[PDB]
Amino acid sequence: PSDGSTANLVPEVNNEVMALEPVVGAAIAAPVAGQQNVIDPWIRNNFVQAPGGEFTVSPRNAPGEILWSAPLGPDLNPYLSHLARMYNGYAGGFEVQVILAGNAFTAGKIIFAAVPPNFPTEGLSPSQVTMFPHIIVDVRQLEPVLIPLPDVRNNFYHYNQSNDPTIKLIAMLYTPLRANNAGDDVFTVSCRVLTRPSPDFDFIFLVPPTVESRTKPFTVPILTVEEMTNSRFPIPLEKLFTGPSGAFVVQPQNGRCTTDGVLLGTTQLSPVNICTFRGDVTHIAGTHDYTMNLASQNWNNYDPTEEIPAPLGTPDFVGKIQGVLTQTTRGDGSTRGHKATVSTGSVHFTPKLGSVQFTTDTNNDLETGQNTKFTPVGVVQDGNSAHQNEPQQWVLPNYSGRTGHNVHLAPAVAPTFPGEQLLFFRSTMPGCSGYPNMNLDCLLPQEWVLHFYQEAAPAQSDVALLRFVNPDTGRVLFECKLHKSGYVTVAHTGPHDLVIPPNGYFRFDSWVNQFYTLAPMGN
Amino acid sequence: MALEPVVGAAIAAPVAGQQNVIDPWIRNNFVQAPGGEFTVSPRNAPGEILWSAPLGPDLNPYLSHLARMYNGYAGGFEVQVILAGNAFTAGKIIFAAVPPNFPTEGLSPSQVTMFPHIIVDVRQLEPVLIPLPDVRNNFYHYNQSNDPTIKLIAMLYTPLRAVFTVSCRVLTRPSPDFDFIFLVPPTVESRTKPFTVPILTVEEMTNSRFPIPLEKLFTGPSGAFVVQPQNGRCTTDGVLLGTTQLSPVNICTFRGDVTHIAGTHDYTMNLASQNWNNYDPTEEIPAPLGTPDFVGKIQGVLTQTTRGDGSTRGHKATVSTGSVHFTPKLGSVQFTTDTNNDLETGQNTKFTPVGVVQDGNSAHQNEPQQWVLPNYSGRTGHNVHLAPAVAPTFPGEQLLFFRSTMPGCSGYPNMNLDCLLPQEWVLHFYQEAAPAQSDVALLRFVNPDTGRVLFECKLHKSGYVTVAHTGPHDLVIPPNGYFRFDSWVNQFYTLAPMG
Amino acid sequence: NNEVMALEPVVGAAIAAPVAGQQNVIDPWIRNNFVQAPGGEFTVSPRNAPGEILWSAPLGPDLNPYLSHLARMYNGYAGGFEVQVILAGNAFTAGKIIFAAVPPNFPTEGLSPSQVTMFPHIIVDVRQLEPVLIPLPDVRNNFYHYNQSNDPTIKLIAMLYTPLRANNAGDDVFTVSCRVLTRPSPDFDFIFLVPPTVESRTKPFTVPILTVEEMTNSRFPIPLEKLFTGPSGAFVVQPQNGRCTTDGVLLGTTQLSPVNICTFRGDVTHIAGTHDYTMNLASQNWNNYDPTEEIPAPLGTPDFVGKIQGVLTQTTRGDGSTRGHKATVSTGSVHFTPKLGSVQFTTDTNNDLETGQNTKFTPVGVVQDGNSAHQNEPQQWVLPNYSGRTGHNVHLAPAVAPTFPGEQLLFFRCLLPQEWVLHFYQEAAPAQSDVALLRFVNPDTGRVLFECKLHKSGYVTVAHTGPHDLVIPPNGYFRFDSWVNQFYTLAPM
Amino acid sequence: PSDGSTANLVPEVNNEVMALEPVVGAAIAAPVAGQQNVIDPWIRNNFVQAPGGEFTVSPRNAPGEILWSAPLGPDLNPYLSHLARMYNGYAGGFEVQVILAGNAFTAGKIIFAAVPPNFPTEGLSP
Ligand SMILES: [Cl-]
Ligand SMILES: [Cl-]
Ligand SMILES: [Cl-]
Ligand SMILES: [Cl-]
């Protein structure tokens, strides 16, 4: 029966069964629900992969790590997820199916456990997880694991828009993954979670779709690298780059945005205003330098009291940016435009306090009362020092100059998982004079910032798994982890410029956590 | 009474592949259609089809969202019509069900009575109920196909007697025999995403004709000019037009190799594509994408980098559009710079635009003519593959422009720049590619503090907006106001006057 | 996931009986024996990643060569198939494949693995020994299908769900080879008997058995030499001769005669005192030339820039005068305007061409100017301006470039032999996908040397990088193997 | 039963069967043959390796290659091959046994097929 296929090398099914009583679904809610609704019976009879339906057991994982977790709710099932945007509430349980059919040369155990509502999941130890209803499964198990997930609760049903907690299903590495295949230890166990609603699950109140915040689904734009723009300087993107970041500190303040659309640092939505300055200008006697008193991005007054490190779009590196100051007189429409340069490392670069200093090519021809705009163009380098040393993209300017220290900064960013490096969207700045370091890396393209901002999709976990696909060949080039904090990571060691098909796009495949093990990509 | 019952998806069971069920509550509530907004005004006459819709899931917003999950459907609707008349408003409207392959073009009001129909007086208070059965000659309909279905038609049956515009609404709900057929994943390639307009504010968006932020909305008469820009041209279903491309930074840039012209401070640039790829002049495009679409002199900076040592140079530079040496379709443009010796030929060079200039000795505010297209192939031929020109079509209506003010670098220039669509709207339509269910998408501008509707405008499928006003006007807008897509309408829709 | 596909039963031709003309029978042996689809091959390799569609096919007679041959004598069909898929693995492997049924008119392109799970589906372990049986029902919204209408059908899709994890053995990488077999379900049947091989959409596609030597170039009236592959980044490959689509639509300036490829016919006029002559052109059938016709130029206009020397010939009506003169045409001269009707020749006599008499230019060779750069005069990939500076070149055949990584164009040294153009033109077989797989066979030994992709458009591509003259046996021929979905990755040289 | 040997690591037997009808042998020929002859019954009850009875599946082989082929006749059996040098004709069929007991770490499939007389074998695709 199983000769030449599985060969009795592998557990067939699990004895163990979770110690949960049966729990009623939406039937109790009928006298107090507005309506009695119906789900397409095919959805109830057929397992489909959950939005967060991928996880991995690899040798990089350590015992105690939660490899997969989810609270009970419509987001456990992609059909129910779209249906949920059309309903106000729900009640009832799920049947979850887990596939763990690892190669016969591997070893290890996973614990699945149901933790009840309002118990904190955060510090849980393997010992502690054993005290909930639980199942211990071998990483080699052949037949899918079936876990019923009842809607334990103390009310008639749940509202989509509230924060009342539900049961959480937890999968934790109970034993480290080991293997004895005698080759190279590539035998990572790729796992899939599929679900379907129990018969007692049901939606409750029909409401206008797409308007309830907590049901908007997450997506990632189909745009290509060439079609997007750098989020730290008004320039197009050119290539994808990964490299080690142990030496320096990656803490940009432009192109910083969370997956659910919260802007951070000095980040704003306009791709053109990313290194612009607007305000009134003042001559410095005897020199070609001017002092600019800052206006807001929309020509209103700037308030330093805002919980921001600087005005939105303030440059986030130390260097000399060359551009053009332009000015217009309201009465006659006279216009003047002169080459100008701002050094963000100068002690007179204090944009948090309201003033920035330019060095121009005139000591006249700039009025004191007219509005003036600095349009950035490129970066320059002092030719007498070491080549490629002046524009230090990972050095933050002192936004308050000599006074005080930088405040309310967006956090720094580093890989957290063994074997992983940041993935940078790299643009090449124009040089205007000298031998400058023209490399510019941002964490998120500006169009991704726009997309996350408008569609405020609740993050289902801390990491969105993306795969980069060549639409010509249908092939995946690499996979990467987009963290909710707004940065991307890949599995690679060393610097590398990526070889990308011109048509390549990012595709969102699954919600995962920080312990997901990425396929080795480079070379 | 004039139509028999018509079976829905039940007949399809032996060939369907699956048996599905729709939430029965969806058929217990009349709800306004994604279209479902039309207007009767005294400008309208009998014979104009004032409103029409085909049977399908797009008749009902609940079914419309569901349809993203199904491959097909079958069955009928019950539709409810509501007319906001008053006792001084005389006239009759006919609604009629016209069967799938009957031509509607040319119908008289008399002829419309020969279909299943209802004749309702414009001053009626109570809603009228129309049955819409899914008459067909196949087992069911596919969502991805445009096989025809019964059409509901609304026209004026007798002339209207009344500036009084009658607001009308169409609501629907599925018949009990309606059902979807094959459960399928909601993918992006399905083209089942419904059409929307970004939540972004005018203030926070960007002009599609020059790399500047937007500033205000402007309406004006356009009889003097020919409105035919080639940037910021995109269809609501995401088809780019003219020289329009997606990157908001490349909207007036040039990249290529540079050559000195002896004895002057002028240089010739041999152009490459935006991707630093070889340039092909055989493409069906008026010019390379991002080429300026107005006649004027644009001041910026030429930038150059030497492969090997990292040498970088930057010099004030100026492009004169419409000059005889402006031939970007042929592959070359001419700059006037502030140097005659310091630009190497082998190296790649980029023009970063900043602003426009005007010769101060000529008439003030005359140099940048935004509504005059340059000659993309210079003297050696005429412009080709153009995006069509744009003009108001409905009496009393003018174009609505998204206005930003260009930086001036010298002189007394016309710093006014109007685009038909914000660049972010081009981006949004491109990615979403929502199929247009009619020729006009009605937009309303909303104050989010109160929810109040400030004005309505027509976003035409061709990718341009019109509004009801006469004379020039800068719009007085709350800084946080946003555009909202409200309904599909047709060319006969009468906009509420604004101002 | 119980190994059963979540599809309802779907009736075949039984529903059609009240509306079909007649009742027919299929030989029961065809019904009882699984047969491999021509494109029914795919491979699971460790490079494969989740989401990659390894194989796809639409329901139809083209899956089964018996039904395909039978269909050429019937008017329609209805009903489904039983599919048998065989997986070549062992107990030391891990990984999952999903097979999914996608309903008619739904796009297969861009699906994520999560989304594919949302169809009726089956998840099969790479260790499965017994063949997997998938029923492919004829989901449709009509009573039955007509052969000539090419209705859309269900598609079977095979996608990698879990990567293959297995040791290798030495430097040989372990792969799981898969085969797709089919046979008609009991409810499948053909419908109306009709004269065989008449209905166009049932003709099978073929490729001439001719050898490279035995064929002829399509861009100049000269034989072929060898098969050449090379990178094409430096230049634009956009010929206008030898451009013909697989189902027999001619493109650009391509015509059928293998000798009229670079010829001119018309009446000739002297330019006083010079060695120049002006020819007002006709057609190749000796009719007036119409500039309104949506063609680049008269058919057979050369598709490169150069100076071609040949011989003009003229015959005077009435006396039998016979004149033949060495002559030269420059397609790069400013007076080459064939779209408007004129070309200029440079001869070695200034008084030997009468007025009003028919004159024909015969092509023999091209010429090189020894004072300019060597190997510079015959520019193969540069088109002339047929309009000759008036307006612009219009209605050109599209340019041609490989789009799949690792592939370069395969040239006949032209994109298609002239005999291939003739074959496609006559036997106008519909293409079942965008790519026809061709195999190159040595008839003596019977073994296959390489395979190439013949695109629906008139061009061929091969798997190799860098320029190369091919290692061709003298009697080798191309043999058509199958239509393949555009993701098919071919083995290198 | 197989604990310690083969160990369910390998397929045991094929349930597939060739779709051929039964065919009479030399019995039909008795009224027109010269004689009714006899073969030593041991030859009929015991498998012996054919003259061409070795073939290999190796990684150097490519799919589509015919690894083994033979037409029906006395040459399929070494005893019958010696006996056939004494007789003028023959009629009837054979039972052939193929041994494929490959190592458990290998993979791949072979097709066995019966092609009828007067069909060309030379160009056959899988
Ligand atoms: Cl809605
Ligand atoms: Cl989805
Ligand atoms: Cl959406
Ligand atoms: Cl209109």
XYZ file of C-alpha atoms and ligand atoms in Angstrom, chain A residues 85 217, chain B residues 68 193, ligand 3:
5
model
C -15.323 43.362 4.710
C -6.456 43.705 3.290
C -14.661 39.470 -7.071
C -11.591 45.645 -8.539
Cl -9.373 46.392 -2.428
